[PDB]
Design a protein around this ligand. Structure first.
Ligand SMILES: [Mg+2]
Ligand SMILES: [Mg+2]
Ligand SMILES: [Mg+2]
Ligand SMILES: [Mg+2]
Ligand SMILES: [Mg+2]
Ligand SMILES: [Mg+2]
Ligand SMILES: [Mg+2]
Ligand SMILES: [Mg+2]
Ligand SMILES: [Mg+2]
Ligand SMILES: [Mg+2]
Ligand SMILES: [Mg+2]
Ligand SMILES: [Mg+2]
Ligand SMILES: [Mg+2]
Ligand SMILES: [Mg+2]
Ligand SMILES: [Mg+2]
Ligand SMILES: [Mg+2]
Ligand SMILES: [Mg+2]
Ligand SMILES: [Mg+2]
Ligand SMILES: [Mg+2]
Ligand SMILES: [Mg+2]
Ligand SMILES: [Mg+2]
Ligand SMILES: [Mg+2]
Ligand SMILES: [Mg+2]
Ligand SMILES: [Mg+2]
Ligand SMILES: [Mg+2]
Ligand SMILES: [Mg+2]
Ligand SMILES: [Mg+2]
Ligand SMILES: [Mg+2]
Ligand SMILES: [Mg+2]
Ligand SMILES: [Mg+2]
Ligand SMILES: [Mg+2]
Ligand SMILES: [Mg+2]
Ligand SMILES: [Mg+2]
Ligand SMILES: [Mg+2]
Ligand SMILES: [Mg+2]
Ligand SMILES: [Mg+2]
Ligand SMILES: [Mg+2]
Ligand SMILES: [Mg+2]
Ligand SMILES: [Mg+2]
Ligand SMILES: [Mg+2]
Ligand SMILES: [Mg+2]
Ligand SMILES: [Mg+2]
Ligand SMILES: [Mg+2]
Ligand SMILES: [Mg+2]
Ligand SMILES: [Mg+2]
Ligand SMILES: [Mg+2]
Ligand SMILES: [Mg+2]
Ligand SMILES: [Mg+2]
Ligand SMILES: [Mg+2]
Ligand SMILES: [Mg+2]
Ligand SMILES: [Mg+2]
Ligand SMILES: [Mg+2]
Ligand SMILES: [Mg+2]
Ligand SMILES: [Mg+2]
Ligand SMILES: [Mg+2]
Ligand SMILES: [Mg+2]
Ligand SMILES: [Mg+2]
Ligand SMILES: [Mg+2]
Ligand SMILES: [Mg+2]
Ligand SMILES: [Mg+2]
Ligand SMILES: [Mg+2]
Ligand SMILES: [Mg+2]
Ligand SMILES: [Mg+2]
Ligand SMILES: [Mg+2]
Ligand SMILES: [Mg+2]
Ligand SMILES: [Mg+2]
Ligand SMILES: [Mg+2]
Ligand SMILES: [Mg+2]
Ligand SMILES: [Mg+2]
Ligand SMILES: [Mg+2]
Ligand SMILES: [Mg+2]
Ligand SMILES: [Mg+2]
Ligand SMILES: [Mg+2]
Ligand SMILES: [Mg+2]
Ligand SMILES: [Mg+2]
Ligand SMILES: [Mg+2]
Ligand SMILES: [Mg+2]
Ligand SMILES: [Mg+2]
Ligand SMILES: [Mg+2]
Ligand SMILES: [Mg+2]
Ligand SMILES: [Mg+2]
Ligand SMILES: [Mg+2]
Ligand SMILES: [Mg+2]
Ligand SMILES: [Mg+2]
Ligand SMILES: [Mg+2]
Ligand SMILES: [Mg+2]
Ligand SMILES: [Mg+2]
Ligand SMILES: [Mg+2]
Ligand SMILES: [Mg+2]
Ligand SMILES: [Mg+2]
Ligand SMILES: [Mg+2]
Ligand SMILES: [Mg+2]
Ligand SMILES: [Mg+2]
Ligand SMILES: [Mg+2]
Ligand SMILES: [Mg+2]
Ligand SMILES: [Mg+2]
Ligand SMILES: [Mg+2]
Ligand SMILES: [Mg+2]
Ligand SMILES: [Mg+2]
Ligand SMILES: [Mg+2]
Ligand SMILES: [Mg+2]
Ligand SMILES: [Mg+2]
Ligand SMILES: [Mg+2]
Ligand SMILES: [Mg+2]
Ligand SMILES: [Mg+2]
Ligand SMILES: [Mg+2]
Ligand SMILES: [Mg+2]
Ligand SMILES: [Mg+2]
Ligand SMILES: [Mg+2]
Ligand SMILES: [Mg+2]
Ligand SMILES: [Mg+2]
Ligand SMILES: [Mg+2]
Ligand SMILES: [Mg+2]
Ligand SMILES: [Mg+2]
Ligand SMILES: [Mg+2]
Ligand SMILES: [Mg+2]
Ligand SMILES: [Mg+2]
Ligand SMILES: [Mg+2]
Ligand SMILES: [Mg+2]
Ligand SMILES: [Mg+2]
Ligand SMILES: [Mg+2]
Ligand SMILES: [Mg+2]
Ligand SMILES: [Mg+2]
Ligand SMILES: [Mg+2]
Ligand SMILES: [Mg+2]
Ligand SMILES: [Mg+2]
Ligand SMILES: [Mg+2]
Ligand SMILES: [Mg+2]
Ligand SMILES: [Mg+2]
Ligand SMILES: [Mg+2]
Ligand SMILES: [Mg+2]
Ligand SMILES: [Mg+2]
Ligand SMILES: [Mg+2]
Ligand SMILES: [Mg+2]
Ligand SMILES: [Mg+2]
Ligand SMILES: [Mg+2]
Ligand SMILES: [Mg+2]
Ligand SMILES: [Mg+2]
Ligand SMILES: [Mg+2]
Ligand SMILES: [Mg+2]
Ligand SMILES: [Mg+2]
Ligand SMILES: [Mg+2]
Ligand SMILES: [Mg+2]
Ligand SMILES: [Mg+2]
Ligand SMILES: [Mg+2]
Ligand SMILES: [Mg+2]
Ligand SMILES: [Mg+2]
Ligand SMILES: [Mg+2]
Ligand SMILES: [Mg+2]
Ligand SMILES: [Mg+2]
Ligand SMILES: [Mg+2]
Ligand SMILES: [Mg+2]
Ligand SMILES: [Mg+2]
Ligand SMILES: [Mg+2]
Ligand SMILES: [Mg+2]
Ligand SMILES: [Mg+2]
Ligand SMILES: [Mg+2]
Ligand SMILES: [Mg+2]
Ligand SMILES: [Mg+2]
Ligand SMILES: [Mg+2]
Ligand SMILES: [Mg+2]
Ligand SMILES: [Mg+2]
Ligand SMILES: [Mg+2]
Ligand SMILES: [Mg+2]
Ligand SMILES: [Mg+2]
Ligand SMILES: [Mg+2]
Ligand SMILES: [Mg+2]
Ligand SMILES: [Mg+2]
Ligand SMILES: [Mg+2]
Ligand SMILES: [Mg+2]
Ligand SMILES: [Mg+2]
Ligand SMILES: [Mg+2]
Ligand SMILES: [Mg+2]
Ligand SMILES: [Mg+2]
Ligand SMILES: [Mg+2]
Ligand SMILES: [Mg+2]
Ligand SMILES: [Mg+2]
Ligand SMILES: [Mg+2]
Ligand SMILES: [Mg+2]
Ligand SMILES: [Mg+2]
Ligand SMILES: [Mg+2]
Ligand SMILES: [Mg+2]
Ligand SMILES: [Mg+2]
Ligand SMILES: [Mg+2]
Ligand SMILES: [Mg+2]
Ligand SMILES: [Mg+2]
Ligand SMILES: [Mg+2]
Ligand SMILES: [Mg+2]
Ligand SMILES: [Mg+2]
Ligand SMILES: [Mg+2]
Ligand SMILES: [Mg+2]
Ligand SMILES: [Mg+2]
Ligand SMILES: [Mg+2]
Ligand SMILES: [Mg+2]
Ligand SMILES: [Mg+2]
Ligand SMILES: [Mg+2]
Ligand SMILES: [Mg+2]
Ligand SMILES: [Mg+2]
Ligand SMILES: [Mg+2]
Ligand SMILES: [Mg+2]
Ligand SMILES: [Mg+2]
Ligand SMILES: [Mg+2]
Ligand SMILES: [Mg+2]
Ligand SMILES: [Mg+2]
Ligand SMILES: [Mg+2]
Ligand SMILES: [Mg+2]
Ligand SMILES: [Mg+2]
Ligand SMILES: [Mg+2]
Ligand SMILES: [Mg+2]
Ligand SMILES: [Mg+2]
Ligand SMILES: [Mg+2]
Ligand SMILES: [Mg+2]
Ligand SMILES: [Mg+2]
Ligand SMILES: [Mg+2]
Ligand SMILES: [Mg+2]
Ligand SMILES: [Mg+2]
Ligand SMILES: [Mg+2]
Ligand SMILES: [Mg+2]
Ligand SMILES: [Mg+2]
Ligand SMILES: [Mg+2]
Ligand SMILES: [Mg+2]
Ligand SMILES: [Mg+2]
Ligand SMILES: [Mg+2]
Ligand SMILES: [Mg+2]
Ligand SMILES: [Mg+2]
Ligand SMILES: [Mg+2]
Ligand SMILES: [Mg+2]
Ligand SMILES: [Mg+2]
Ligand SMILES: [Mg+2]
Ligand SMILES: [Mg+2]
Ligand SMILES: [Mg+2]
Ligand SMILES: [Mg+2]
Ligand SMILES: [Mg+2]
Ligand SMILES: [Mg+2]
Ligand SMILES: [Mg+2]
Ligand SMILES: [Mg+2]
Ligand SMILES: [Mg+2]
Ligand SMILES: [Mg+2]
Ligand SMILES: [Mg+2]
Ligand SMILES: [Mg+2]
Ligand SMILES: [Mg+2]
Ligand SMILES: [Mg+2]
Ligand SMILES: [Mg+2]
Ligand SMILES: [Mg+2]
Ligand SMILES: [Mg+2]
Ligand SMILES: [Mg+2]
Ligand SMILES: [Mg+2]
Ligand SMILES: [Mg+2]
Ligand SMILES: [Mg+2]
Ligand SMILES: [Mg+2]
Ligand SMILES: [Mg+2]
Ligand SMILES: [Mg+2]
Ligand SMILES: [Mg+2]
Ligand SMILES: [Mg+2]
Ligand SMILES: [Mg+2]
Ligand SMILES: [Mg+2]
Ligand SMILES: [Mg+2]
Ligand SMILES: [Mg+2]
Ligand SMILES: [Mg+2]
Ligand SMILES: [Mg+2]
Ligand SMILES: [Mg+2]
Ligand SMILES: [Mg+2]
Ligand SMILES: [Mg+2]
Ligand SMILES: [Mg+2]
Ligand SMILES: [Mg+2]
Ligand SMILES: [Mg+2]
Ligand SMILES: [Mg+2]
Ligand SMILES: [Mg+2]
Ligand SMILES: [Mg+2]
Ligand SMILES: [Mg+2]
Ligand SMILES: [Mg+2]
Ligand SMILES: [Mg+2]
Ligand SMILES: [Mg+2]
Ligand SMILES: [Mg+2]
Ligand SMILES: [Mg+2]
Ligand SMILES: [Mg+2]
Ligand SMILES: [Mg+2]
Ligand SMILES: [Mg+2]
Ligand SMILES: [Mg+2]
Ligand SMILES: [Mg+2]
Ligand SMILES: [Mg+2]
Ligand SMILES: [Mg+2]
Ligand SMILES: [Mg+2]
Ligand SMILES: [Mg+2]
Ligand SMILES: [Mg+2]
Ligand SMILES: [Mg+2]
Ligand SMILES: [Mg+2]
Ligand SMILES: [Mg+2]
Ligand SMILES: [Mg+2]
Ligand SMILES: [Mg+2]
Ligand SMILES: [Mg+2]
Ligand SMILES: [Mg+2]
Ligand SMILES: [Mg+2]
Ligand SMILES: [Zn+2]
Lengths: 118, 204, 131, 16, 122, 59
RNA sequence: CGAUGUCGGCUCGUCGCAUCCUGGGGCUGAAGAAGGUCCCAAGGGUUGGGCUGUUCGCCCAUUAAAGCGGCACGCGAGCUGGGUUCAGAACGUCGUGAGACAGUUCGGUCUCUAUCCGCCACGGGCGCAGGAGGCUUGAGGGGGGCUCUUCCUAGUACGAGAGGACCGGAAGGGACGCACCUCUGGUUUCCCAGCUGUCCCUCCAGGGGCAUAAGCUGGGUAGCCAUGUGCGGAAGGGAUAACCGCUGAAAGCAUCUAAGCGGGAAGCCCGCCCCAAGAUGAGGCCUCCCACGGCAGCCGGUAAGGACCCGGGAAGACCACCCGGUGGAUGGGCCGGGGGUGUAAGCGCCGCGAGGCGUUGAGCCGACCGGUCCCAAUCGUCCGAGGUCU
RNA sequence: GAAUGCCGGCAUGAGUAACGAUAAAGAGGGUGAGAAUCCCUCUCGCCGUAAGCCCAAGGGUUCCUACGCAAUGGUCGUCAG
RNA sequence: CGUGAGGGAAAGGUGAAAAGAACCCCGGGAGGGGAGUGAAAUAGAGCCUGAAACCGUGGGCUUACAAGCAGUCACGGCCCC
């Protein structure tokens, strides 16, 4: 049973899954847009949105918070100095997911894009 | 016989004569009668009750017709109470006073594919002493050449829960008419937000 | 419908507001209404609260005391009607929220681990100075 | 009750 | 929650120090004994020249358990050991003293003698 | 276990009866409102790159 | 004998009744209580231990009682492998020997994949002469069925005494069963904190990895849970068993019977709970669409409605079911509350220092109760009546 | 027409079990008819008395480069012993 | 295949003649469709004949209240001659 449980397992153990989200965040915040499988995508939204919201606080504490997942001062500088201001007046939802039309040839996996909002 | 539809909202205990008493709170009212079943017309006696207001955007024409003939706003749920004929055109929690005993029917929580141990309280297998991949297994399911088959109704693994359950003779602890609220002593089938039926008990 | 608010709305008739705030580590005296056939009297229970498990009206707290060579723990509902009053007898300072570990400790060891929470003690004397 | 034993203790083979 | 094989402290001056439950006298097949229940036990440990000696098969009533017991007023109470008091077939304490607190539930179950003799009733 | 095995060969009838559920369901498709091409619904059009009125993607 | 695996245990039962208990009786060398013995009864129940491989048996402590049998001495494609059939070794014994012994002793390979019937669950198809959306009747099934102690009646009836009821009434348990999570108590794989070694970011401070598929430790929400909580066995009607009668001949008496009529079981039928119209005997009610174009049929477009697709879901293996899809609170964010953790970082002050104090119940913070269109459920598509004949 | 016959061919079980250590993956950018699987880069993880590096046996061109993907590779393949 | 002594297979056929299919078309290729050769191309090299099991496409009749070694006897319906 799975009654009222939140969070996909994604056939990864506790730390692989952590690293999975973190690495995707590094990639999302870097290129502004990535392609993944639909399930990874939907789960990535929250993980990244939180990081953006903290960059919206902007304080030392928040930066050090974000660095725990992002681990790259430059990347976080880009987060605070270029990305975060774009959302000053936006109330959550700094990410969107749209599903692509074609599946991966090799395993038939459904694909989607995750991008940062305008 | 009298009854009402309701939703299960949650559980608490209250205090009554220096005693803690577990209650399940149920939002029962208000239920408009939307059809009456009669011996000349239907062959038996009952009252079809509606419950919870619905966006008429989602109610189709055959359903609209039914409501309209009763002069009743569109409702989400229709359900009957046999051998119940309220003098009114609306049924509320006020039909139950504290101290009355009731039967509550709901839809039990669903465990999906349940092992024979969770479902039927089988003893399962030993967990050491050589036990071989049978720790949660049911054992024998039969005999031998005679009868050379397995009985109908053999308790076996399968789906469990998400089925109609009635717990009987529950004390009505309080009723708070202004909030369409019913407080019942003990445990009621199903999850919070679950549709339930409250009937006057059949025990004595 | 807001199922949560409904439940709090039921509980609201039973909610107490007259009790002093305490934390795990504090030493407390709970005066409890007790029945003994055929009269009811007030029995005092005094000890370290070693646990406060929160759930609104349904919060309960556990108090530990060593009575006549034997350890006793009592669990009280925080909004029980059978509680007359609670008297803060001492403020202790814990570093965690549950103190089950004091069960394995000498009276001496507990005394060191649960220093008097000097801060909240000063606050206690700081109020009580009333008009 | 202990009676005879009409079969040896078994063991599985290997087809090929 | 006492069951066969459970060791109990004895909370009296009968001379027994440790009893091991061998039956809970409460129905055809009671799984557990709690405060107020009577068990049949074996005296596993005694002090020289008491009323009881190691080996005896005695009756006793449970006065304290480590498993907390619940009360209708919504509260509970729990002790640091499981203890008992040796009784006779008339449910009366065989010794003349009882040590440590006992559960108030004893009173209503007709063990007044033990309740009185007890230093504290919680 | 003792290695269960099929007692009889399955007949052409019986094997083909089993497969009476094996037909594919054709892809469900809708016209993209921009380029009128046929694509699955709720997916970015892979021909013109449009979704929800706007250009989203380079095709 | 081109194999029907053989004791005992465990698991799971199911049946018989020559009945162990509980229910109903007759006789008693039945005063009462408690027994004896036979009759009716298979609904339910029939405990935990010590010894032995044991079945059996003995013993301990209880119990209403600790029933006896069948089902390949029920059940090894369900488990075990202690016992029994191999190969090793030894003792007693027999044999010159090799070896042997319903004599003993220690050890000794138990096979991932279920085709058919059967069984537990779940769908797909078609049918139920118009097509649809709801709500139902209950043929017929299944589930359940146990029992004890104490008190009152009453220290009364009965007894010299000890002892001690019928009938009726009230309370509290044991085991079992169904549900539930308010409380008690678990778990809670990253919800919080503390700790070690190492490597790293970035030197300090602060952090990240790894030490398990959580490094370790102390806690812990929702959920799923029992040790926790609510509730069930009935009541009640009916017909009966043994058994007891009323009236009453044959047979002037007598006779429960040959006419007729009563009483009478935990058992039987209803009643309770659950499934159920594939009940092809395919039921019923309420509502909606409707008189389409072409030549009981066909092709095509629609109506009411349905499906597809999507956001989801205490629903769930897939499927199904249920909710919602911008005329929207469905999930994700965000905000408030709850809840866990237990006073973040930074700074200031104190100490030579490990640290400590204040800022501060702080900071962080899964799932719970909500709000909020910020993100996504865009845009659509395909099916779908014209009602056969007495 | 049968010999658990002999040789071959094709069925059934079945779109089933499995795809060979639970050290682990993610994204961007290239190439190409085609890419989860080939090249590049960044992030993550695993070994480190080894899962690194040297000999000897044994193997015998498998080495390097160009051009290829029918088969071999337990999938794919533009890559490869 | 076996350390070795030793064991030990399978595998024949275009056409009279290569006249072995220029050239175009789809395709990455394989493969095919036209053109062409030939008396003949389902003689197209995976090549004479090309049986059977086995797999498929199209059509006729038939099947979702029915009991079986699958046939047989009878009658009726539908399709064909
Ligand atoms: Mg699980
Ligand atoms: Mg949820
Ligand atoms: Mg989930
Ligand atoms: Mg997670
Ligand atoms: Mg993955
Ligand atoms: Mg997994
Ligand atoms: Mg995977
Ligand atoms: Mg997995
Ligand atoms: Mg993986
Ligand atoms: Mg780890
Ligand atoms: Mg780029
Ligand atoms: Mg959050
Ligand atoms: Mg997609
Ligand atoms: Mg596709
Ligand atoms: Mg592939
Ligand atoms: Mg898609
Ligand atoms: Mg009626
Ligand atoms: Mg319902
Ligand atoms: Mg199970
Ligand atoms: Mg299960
Ligand atoms: Mg499980
Ligand atoms: Mg389970
Ligand atoms: Mg169960
Ligand atoms: Mg269980
Ligand atoms: Mg068990
Ligand atoms: Mg067991
Ligand atoms: Mg177990
Ligand atoms: Mg084994
Ligand atoms: Mg195992
Ligand atoms: Mg069976
Ligand atoms: Mg049979
Ligand atoms: Mg069944
Ligand atoms: Mg279900
Ligand atoms: Mg009651
Ligand atoms: Mg709540
Ligand atoms: Mg409160
Ligand atoms: Mg409150
Ligand atoms: Mg000291
Ligand atoms: Mg101060
Ligand atoms: Mg024999
Ligand atoms: Mg003591
Ligand atoms: Mg001794
Ligand atoms: Mg003795
Ligand atoms: Mg095995
Ligand atoms: Mg066959
Ligand atoms: Mg065959
Ligand atoms: Mg077969
Ligand atoms: Mg078959
Ligand atoms: Mg066949
Ligand atoms: Mg076929
Ligand atoms: Mg086919
Ligand atoms: Mg089949
Ligand atoms: Mg568009
Ligand atoms: Mg044989
Ligand atoms: Mg054979
Ligand atoms: Mg054979
Ligand atoms: Mg054989
Ligand atoms: Mg056999
Ligand atoms: Mg046993
Ligand atoms: Mg077993
Ligand atoms: Mg067992
Ligand atoms: Mg049977
Ligand atoms: Mg039996
Ligand atoms: Mg029978
Ligand atoms: Mg007899
Ligand atoms: Mg007996
Ligand atoms: Mg009787
Ligand atoms: Mg009897
Ligand atoms: Mg009798
Ligand atoms: Mg007598
Ligand atoms: Mg007598
Ligand atoms: Mg008598
Ligand atoms: Mg008798
Ligand atoms: Mg006898
Ligand atoms: Mg009999
Ligand atoms: Mg019986
Ligand atoms: Mg039986
Ligand atoms: Mg036993
Ligand atoms: Mg034993
Ligand atoms: Mg034995
Ligand atoms: Mg047996
Ligand atoms: Mg015997
Ligand atoms: Mg014996
Ligand atoms: Mg003997
Ligand atoms: Mg008895
Ligand atoms: Mg008796
Ligand atoms: Mg026994
Ligand atoms: Mg016997
Ligand atoms: Mg038996
Ligand atoms: Mg037998
Ligand atoms: Mg046999
Ligand atoms: Mg036999
Ligand atoms: Mg047997
Ligand atoms: Mg025999
Ligand atoms: Mg037996
Ligand atoms: Mg048997
Ligand atoms: Mg067998
Ligand atoms: Mg068998
Ligand atoms: Mg076996
Ligand atoms: Mg066996
Ligand atoms: Mg078999
Ligand atoms: Mg042995
Ligand atoms: Mg030996
Ligand atoms: Mg001799
Ligand atoms: Mg000799
Ligand atoms: Mg001789
Ligand atoms: Mg011999
Ligand atoms: Mg021998
Ligand atoms: Mg023998
Ligand atoms: Mg012998
Ligand atoms: Mg001997
Ligand atoms: Mg022997
Ligand atoms: Mg032996
Ligand atoms: Mg041996
Ligand atoms: Mg050994
Ligand atoms: Mg052995
Ligand atoms: Mg073995
Ligand atoms: Mg086995
Ligand atoms: Mg295996
Ligand atoms: Mg399989
Ligand atoms: Mg099968
Ligand atoms: Mg068969
Ligand atoms: Mg069969
Ligand atoms: Mg079957
Ligand atoms: Mg089957
Ligand atoms: Mg079935
Ligand atoms: Mg169906
Ligand atoms: Mg079906
Ligand atoms: Mg009809
Ligand atoms: Mg319908
Ligand atoms: Mg009816
Ligand atoms: Mg029926
Ligand atoms: Mg039937
Ligand atoms: Mg009396
Ligand atoms: Mg007397
Ligand atoms: Mg007297
Ligand atoms: Mg009296
Ligand atoms: Mg008298
Ligand atoms: Mg007298
Ligand atoms: Mg007298
Ligand atoms: Mg007396
Ligand atoms: Mg009575
Ligand atoms: Mg009772
Ligand atoms: Mg049962
Ligand atoms: Mg829960
Ligand atoms: Mg909770
Ligand atoms: Mg809990
Ligand atoms: Mg808890
Ligand atoms: Mg815990
Ligand atoms: Mg975390
Ligand atoms: Mg450290
Ligand atoms: Mg570290
Ligand atoms: Mg470095
Ligand atoms: Mg540092
Ligand atoms: Mg740090
Ligand atoms: Mg971490
Ligand atoms: Mg590392
Ligand atoms: Mg680590
Ligand atoms: Mg490492
Ligand atoms: Mg860690
Ligand atoms: Mg907890
Ligand atoms: Mg807790
Ligand atoms: Mg929890
Ligand atoms: Mg329990
Ligand atoms: Mg009756
Ligand atoms: Mg009657
Ligand atoms: Mg009668
Ligand atoms: Mg008479
Ligand atoms: Mg007469
Ligand atoms: Mg007469
Ligand atoms: Mg006469
Ligand atoms: Mg008669
Ligand atoms: Mg006659
Ligand atoms: Mg009668
Ligand atoms: Mg009478
Ligand atoms: Mg009864
Ligand atoms: Mg139905
Ligand atoms: Mg129904
Ligand atoms: Mg029908
Ligand atoms: Mg129905
Ligand atoms: Mg139907
Ligand atoms: Mg029939
Ligand atoms: Mg009808
Ligand atoms: Mg119908
Ligand atoms: Mg009807
Ligand atoms: Mg209706
Ligand atoms: Mg018209
Ligand atoms: Mg029209
Ligand atoms: Mg016409
Ligand atoms: Mg049409
Ligand atoms: Mg429509
Ligand atoms: Mg869906
Ligand atoms: Mg789903
Ligand atoms: Mg579910
Ligand atoms: Mg679906
Ligand atoms: Mg819908
Ligand atoms: Mg739409
Ligand atoms: Mg719209
Ligand atoms: Mg709106
Ligand atoms: Mg929402
Ligand atoms: Mg929300
Ligand atoms: Mg989700
Ligand atoms: Mg929140
Ligand atoms: Mg909050
Ligand atoms: Mg809090
Ligand atoms: Mg501080
Ligand atoms: Mg600080
Ligand atoms: Mg200073
Ligand atoms: Mg200084
Ligand atoms: Mg300084
Ligand atoms: Mg302050
Ligand atoms: Mg905060
Ligand atoms: Mg806060
Ligand atoms: Mg949750
Ligand atoms: Mg709340
Ligand atoms: Mg929420
Ligand atoms: Mg929007
Ligand atoms: Mg709004
Ligand atoms: Mg049409
Ligand atoms: Mg006519
Ligand atoms: Mg042949
Ligand atoms: Mg022949
Ligand atoms: Mg064979
Ligand atoms: Mg054979
Ligand atoms: Mg042969
Ligand atoms: Mg042959
Ligand atoms: Mg062959
Ligand atoms: Mg499949
Ligand atoms: Mg299979
Ligand atoms: Mg499978
Ligand atoms: Mg394999
Ligand atoms: Mg598989
Ligand atoms: Mg592999
Ligand atoms: Mg493998
Ligand atoms: Mg393999
Ligand atoms: Mg593997
Ligand atoms: Mg693998
Ligand atoms: Mg793996
Ligand atoms: Mg690791
Ligand atoms: Mg993997
Ligand atoms: Mg690329
Ligand atoms: Mg290109
Ligand atoms: Mg690739
Ligand atoms: Mg490729
Ligand atoms: Mg790539
Ligand atoms: Mg790869
Ligand atoms: Mg090293
Ligand atoms: Mg090492
Ligand atoms: Mg060489
Ligand atoms: Mg080689
Ligand atoms: Mg080569
Ligand atoms: Mg070169
Ligand atoms: Mg290749
Ligand atoms: Mg290839
Ligand atoms: Mg290829
Ligand atoms: Mg080539
Ligand atoms: Mg390949
Ligand atoms: Mg391979
Ligand atoms: Mg290439
Ligand atoms: Mg290359
Ligand atoms: Mg190679
Ligand atoms: Mg190379
Ligand atoms: Mg070789
Ligand atoms: Mg070789
Ligand atoms: Mg060679
Ligand atoms: Mg040839
Ligand atoms: Mg030639
Ligand atoms: Mg030629
Ligand atoms: Mg080309
Ligand atoms: Mg081309
Ligand atoms: Mg070309
Ligand atoms: Mg290529
Ligand atoms: Mg070609
Ligand atoms: Mg060609
Ligand atoms: Mg020619
Ligand atoms: Mg020509
Ligand atoms: Mg010619
Ligand atoms: Mg030609
Ligand atoms: Mg040709
Ligand atoms: Mg030819
Ligand atoms: Mg020729
Ligand atoms: Mg040919
Ligand atoms: Mg051919
Ligand atoms: Mg052929
Ligand atoms: Mg054919
Ligand atoms: Mg066809
Ligand atoms: Mg055909
Ligand atoms: Mg029929
Ligand atoms: Mg038919
Ligand atoms: Mg048939
Ligand atoms: Mg037939
Ligand atoms: Mg036949
Ligand atoms: Mg005829
Ligand atoms: Zn388009």
């Amino acid at each position: 049973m799975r009654h009222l449980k939140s969070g996909r397992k994604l056939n990864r153990h506790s730390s692989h899954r952590l690293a999975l989200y973190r690495n995707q965040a590094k990639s999302l915040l870097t290129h502004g847009r990535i392609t993944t499988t639909v399930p990874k995508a939907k789960e990535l939204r929250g993980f990244v949105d939180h990081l953006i919201h903290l960059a919206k606080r902007g304080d030392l504490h928040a930066r050090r918070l974000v660095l725990r997942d992002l681990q790259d001062v430059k990347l976080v500088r880009k987060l605070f100095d270029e990305i975060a201001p774009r959302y000053r007046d936006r109330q959550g939802g700094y990410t969107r997911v749209l599903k692509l039309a074609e599946r991966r040839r090799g395993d038939g996996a459904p694909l989607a894009l995750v991008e940062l909002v305008e | 016989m009298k009854g009402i539809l309701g939703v299960k909202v949650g559980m608490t205990r209250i205090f009554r004569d220096d005693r803690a008493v577990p209650v399940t709170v149920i939002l029962a009212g208000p239920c408009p009668v939307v059809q009456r079943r009669t011996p000349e017309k239907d062959g038996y006696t009952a009252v079809q009750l509606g419950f919870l207001p619905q966006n008429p955007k989602r109610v189709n024409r055959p359903l609209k017709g039914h409501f309209a003939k009763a002069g009743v706003e569109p409702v989400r749920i229709l359900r009957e109470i046999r051998d119940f004929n309220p003098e009114g055109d609306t049924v509320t929690v006020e039909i139950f006073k504290p101290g009355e005993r009731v039967d509550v029917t709901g839809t039990s929580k669903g465990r999906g594919f349940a092992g024979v141990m969770k479902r039927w309280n089988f003893a399962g297998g030993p967990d050491s002493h050589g036990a071989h991949k049978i720790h949660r297994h049911p054992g024998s399911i039969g005999n031998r050449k005679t009868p050379g088959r397995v009985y109908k109704g053999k308790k076996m693994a399968g789906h469990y829960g998400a089925e109609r359950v009635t717990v009987m003779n529950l004390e009505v602890v309080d009723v708070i008419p202004e909030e369409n609220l019913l407080l019942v002593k003990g445990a009621v089938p199903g999850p919070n937000g679950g549709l339930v039926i409250v009937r006057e008990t059949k025990k004595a | 419908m807001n199922r949560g608010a409904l439940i709090k709305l039921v509980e609201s008739r039973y909610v107490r507001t007259d009790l002093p705030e305490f934390r795990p580590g504090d030493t407390v005296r709970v005066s409890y209404k007790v029945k003994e056939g055929n009269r009811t009297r007030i029995q005092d229970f005094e000890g370290i609260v070693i646990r406060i498990r929160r759930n609104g009206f349904n919060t309960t707290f556990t108090v530990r005391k060593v009575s006549y060579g034997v350890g006793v723990e009592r669990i009280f509902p925080l909004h029980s009607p059978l509680i007359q009053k609670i008297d803060i007898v001492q403020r202790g300072r814990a570093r965690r929220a549950k103190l089950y570990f004091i069960r394995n400790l000498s009276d001496r060891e507990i005394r060191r681990k649960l220093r008097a929470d000097r801060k909240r003690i000063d606050q206690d004397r700081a109020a009580e100075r009333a008009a | 009750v202990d009676k005879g034993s009409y079969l040896p203790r078994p063991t599985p083979p290997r087809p090929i | 929650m006492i069951q066969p094989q459970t060791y109990l402290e004895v909370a009296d001056n009968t001379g027994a120090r440790k009893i091991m439950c061998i039956r809970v006298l409460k129905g055809s097949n009671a799984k557990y004994a709690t405060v107020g229940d009577v068990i049949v036990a074996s005296v596993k440990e005694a002090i020289p020249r008491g009323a009881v000696k190691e080996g005896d098969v005695v009756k006793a009533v449970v006065v304290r358990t480590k498993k907390e017991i619940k009360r209708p007023d919504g509260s509970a109470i729990r002790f640091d050991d499981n203890a008992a008091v040796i009784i006779n077939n008339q449910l009366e304490p065989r010794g003349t003293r009882v040590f440590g607190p006992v559960a108030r539930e004893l009173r209503e179950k007709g063990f007044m003698k033990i309740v009185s003799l007890a230093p504290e009733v919680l | 276990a003792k290695h269960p095995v099929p007692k009889k060969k399955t007949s052409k009838a019986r094997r083909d009866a089993r497969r009476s559920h094996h037909a594919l369901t054709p892809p469900t498709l809708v016209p993209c409102p921009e380029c009128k091409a046929m694509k699955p619904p709720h997916t970015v059009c892979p021909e013109c790159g449009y979704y929800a009125g706007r250009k989203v993607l380079e095709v």
